[PDB]
Design a protein around this ligand. Structure first.
Ligand SMILES: O=P(O)(O)OC[C@H](O)[C@@H](O)C(O)NO
Ligand SMILES: O=P(O)(O)OC[C@H](O)[C@@H](O)C(O)NO
Ligand SMILES: [Mg+2]
Ligand SMILES: [Mg+2]
Lengths: 214, 215
């Protein structure tokens, strides 16, 4: 399988998000309700986006930290396909969210941003979690933290544990060759698509490069 | 000084939250916009609740995990006084949220969960963070995790490091004596107030017990 392409709608309001979706919804595989849009608009953003694009996978990037069953159910009742749980959530939070995902035939991803451990990685695996998002923090990036070999070896290690790995966090087109040879499940782009002079070209170039590399 | 009482509005809609606030707004110190309510309604929950109760401290329990400046600014533009940042956030995320908080004369709390370390705690202090929320996860609680010895020791050590400590996570009235003798800044009660037969009397019982235990 080729890595899928996900657009992150890190917008504060629906109308701002639609400025992007009206250009590129058909140019990507997955539409993400970004955490910024989850907090700006609430779960209506999931419901509205899935009604607009029912044939796309909709990911609610809620970064659930507790109340796994409650928050997941809210997102799944709004018709999310997938939801995120932040890495430092209690293991029972992740388990809870996953139990609810299964009722809706959806899925849970653990968002790996900031501090987490390899022991937690094993715990998620034993809990039946099959997806992680290897996600360089926007704020770490802004402080000058680049992608590096340690990221590549961590991603390969996660893949080898049986996770379908998503790669994200200020990704630019030119970053993609860093990950060649790894069976990446999804690459996410937010800013590099939404804020490009031509969002359509930016999305197609991502897809082109992925097809060439994989 | 008496521990203050915070009500957690973990409601999915505003009207459900108001069924509680109309009863207990004046019976508590801090009004928390629960994570559940932030995700249910979005940041308008902060704006609306502050407009109803402008004289109270309003906490947006956003549990910010990244994009500290952006999310914190959304909450503070909605007139929040305090915001939460989840403890595994990159340190620059915590710093970013605090930078924006100071611009609004507000504050940030680090919300404790997972496998945080004492060196990370020192980082938060060094970054200028003065509040932490020592929380038992709802889901841990449902799996049978109880308050106990290790919690008391950790809370005391956080206080000695200079943090004001909030304690929370399925607190019932009978849990308060466990923390006697520790200078707790805030106790949060969500379910134990919202779901009581009489929310007003539940809140007052918490206040009476605190006044006795810390008096
Ligand atoms: O490509 P970006 O602008 O960094 O956005 C994608 C990223 O995954 C964000 O949505 C995010 O969740 N950051 O924490
Ligand atoms: O007393 P509760 O129903 O547990 O609610 C308070 C708690 O702090 C929640 O608001 C929360 O943030 N749980 O993670
Ligand atoms: Mg995101
Ligand atoms: Mg809360």
């Amino acid at each position: 399988s080729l890595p899928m392409l996900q657009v992150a709608l890190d917008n504060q309001t629906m109308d701002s998000a639609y400025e992007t979706t009206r250009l590129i919804a058909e140019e990507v595989d997955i539409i993400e309700v970004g955490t910024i849009l989850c907090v700006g608009e609430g779960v209506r953003a999931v419901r509205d986006l899935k009604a607009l694009y029912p044939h796309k996978i909709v990911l609610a990037d809620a970064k659930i930290a507790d109340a796994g069953k409650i928050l997941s159910r809210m997102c799944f009742e709004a018709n999310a396909d997938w939801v995120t749980v932040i890495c430092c959530a209690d293991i029972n939070t992740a388990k809870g969210a996953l139990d609810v995902a299964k009722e809706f035939n959806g899925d849970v991803q653990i968002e790996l941003t900031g501090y987490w451990t390899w022991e937690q990685a094993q715990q998620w695996r034993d809990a039946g979690i099959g997806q992680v998002v290897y996600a360089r923090s926007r704020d770490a990036q802004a402080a000058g933290v680049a992608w590096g070999e340690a990221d590549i070896t961590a991603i390969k290690r996660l893949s080898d544990m049986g996770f379908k790995v998503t790669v994200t966090g200020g990704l630019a087109l030119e970053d993609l060759p860093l990950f060649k040879g790894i069976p990446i499940h999804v690459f996410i782009a937010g800013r590099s698509i939404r804020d490009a002079a031509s969002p359509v070209e930016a999305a197609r170039q991502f897809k082109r490069s992925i097809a060439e590399l994989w």
